[PDB]
Amino acid sequence: ITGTSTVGVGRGVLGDQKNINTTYSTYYYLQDNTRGNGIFTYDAKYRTTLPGSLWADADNQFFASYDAPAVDAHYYAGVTYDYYKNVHNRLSYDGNNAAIRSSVHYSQGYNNAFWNGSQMVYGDGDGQTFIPLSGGIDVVAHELTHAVTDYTAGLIYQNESGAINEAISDIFGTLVEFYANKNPDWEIGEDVYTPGISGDSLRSMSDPAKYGDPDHYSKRYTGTQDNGGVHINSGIINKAAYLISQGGTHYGVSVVGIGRDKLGKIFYRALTQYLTPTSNFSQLRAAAVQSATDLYGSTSQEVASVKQAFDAVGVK
Numbered sequence: 001i002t003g004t005s006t007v008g009v010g011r012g013v014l015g016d017q018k019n020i021n022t023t024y025s026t027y028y029y030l031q032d033n034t035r036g037n038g039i040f041t042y043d044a045k046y047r048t049t050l051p052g053s054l055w056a057d058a059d060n061q062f063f064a065s066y067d068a069p070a071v072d073a074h075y076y077a078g079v080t081y082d083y084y085k086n087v088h089n090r091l092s093y094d095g096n097n098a099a100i101r102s103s104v105h106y107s108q109g110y111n112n113a114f115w116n117g118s119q120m121v122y123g124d125g126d127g128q129t130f131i132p133l134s135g136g137i138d139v140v141a142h143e144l145t146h147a148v149t150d151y152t153a154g155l156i157y158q159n160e161s162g163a164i165n166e167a168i169s170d171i172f173g174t175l176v177e178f179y180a181n182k183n184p185d186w187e188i189g190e191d192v193y194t195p196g197i198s199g200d201s202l203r204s205m206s207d208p209a210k211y212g213d214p215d216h217y218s219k220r221y222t223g224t225q226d227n228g229g230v231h232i233n234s235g236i237i238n239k240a241a242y243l244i245s246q247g248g249t250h251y252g253v254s255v256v257g258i259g260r261d262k263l264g265k266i267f268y269r270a271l272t273q274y275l276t277p278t279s280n281f282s283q284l285r286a287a288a289v290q291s292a293t294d295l296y297g298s299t300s301q302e303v304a305s306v307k308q309a310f311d312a313v314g315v316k
């Protein structure tokens with residue numbers, strides 16, 4: 001909507017206070033004009049019709065329990081925008097400052113969040129498996145990274161290409177989590193998962209097997225569930241990315257870590273220059289090797305570490 005840019009204050013899902021960019025015109029709206037063509041957050045009102053209503057508030061204070069998911073969806077979309085712009089010189093998900101739209105309070109008891117090809121959508125959770133999912137910066141960044149993938153590599157959401165798609169979202173969701181620098185880790189979804197249990201998460205990059213996901217190609221899932229294992233076999237790629245950044249010895253193969261920023265540079269280049277809709281795990285290895293060669297040279301430590309990490313997870 002047309003109005004003037006303002007600054008509201010509210011509390012997120014975890015009870016933390018933050019400022020949010022709003023727009024005033026009779027009401028205060030969750031519309032951040034400071035980033036690209038805007039960030040816009042909507043109320044789905046417990047329904048599945050999308051997007052719902054642009055979020056309107058009478059006083060520019062967002063401290064109600066109902067408000068919390070909206071505050072975080074809005075704020076963490078901004079953080080994600082800032083990561084891509086400042087770290088990768090990418091203007092929104094399309095590279096041309098596309099407006100970022102999100103809806104909260106999707107359905108009732110919905111234990112998930114997703115990019116639907118056009119916008120972000122967040123459930124509130126059932127209160128036991130999940131609390132509202134926009135409370136997790138890694139969740140917000142995971143699903144906005146699907147938008148980036150859709151506009152770039154276009155990885156089809158099935159089998160190995162789909163597992164790469166998922167892993168790319170877990171990798172950049174994590175890198176955004178580190179960028180924001182609040183309790184960062186190599187785990188996925190911890191901030192909003194199982195409020196009754198400390199220290200767990202939905203997936204782990206550091207040890208995918210913690211949650212039953214493979215950490216080596218020899219353990220890959222070959223059946224039809226989960227679109228051919230897209231959230232399962234992502235563990236093989238997530239482990240390779242973790243090893244590239246952090247290092248380690250895995251199934252007897254030693255990897256010299258090169259740190260998170262180089263991991264991000266290599267994988268962002270691979271995603272945006274070298275992956276295609278049908279890329280498999282072997283082709284991802286090749287893309288990462290070429291990306292690292294472009295950036296650092298064929299004889300570099302960075303290239304050597306990318307090779308060892310894929311060796312360590314059984315991907316040739």
Ligand SMILES: COC(=O)[C@@H](N)Cc1ccccc1
Nearest residue numbers: 113114138139142188189202
């Ligand atoms: C299976 O659901 C998926 O993984 C995402 N749709 C939601 C999610 C992302 C990141 C962390 C937690 C949840």
Ligand SMILES: COC(=O)[C@@H](N)Cc1ccccc1
Nearest residue numbers: 202208209210211212213214
């Ligand atoms: C069969 O699937 C399991 O029961 C899931 N909880 C995944 C898992 C497997 C093995 C160990 C830990 C977690």
Ligand SMILES: COC(=O)[C@@H](N)Cc1ccccc1
Nearest residue numbers: 202203211212213214231232
């Ligand atoms: C329930 O979803 C799971 O726990 C995921 N970790 C996928 C999985 C299922 C079963 C066995 C292994 C992996």
Ligand SMILES: [Ca+2]
Nearest residue numbers: 057059061062
């Ligand atoms: Ca208010």
Ligand SMILES: [Ca+2]
Nearest residue numbers: 183184185190
């Ligand atoms: Ca964390």
Ligand SMILES: [Ca+2]
Nearest residue numbers: 138187188189
């Ligand atoms: Ca995390």
Ligand SMILES: [Ca+2]
Nearest residue numbers: 193194195197
């Ligand atoms: Ca928990």
Ligand SMILES: [Zn+2]
Nearest residue numbers: 142146166169
């Ligand atoms: Zn995903």
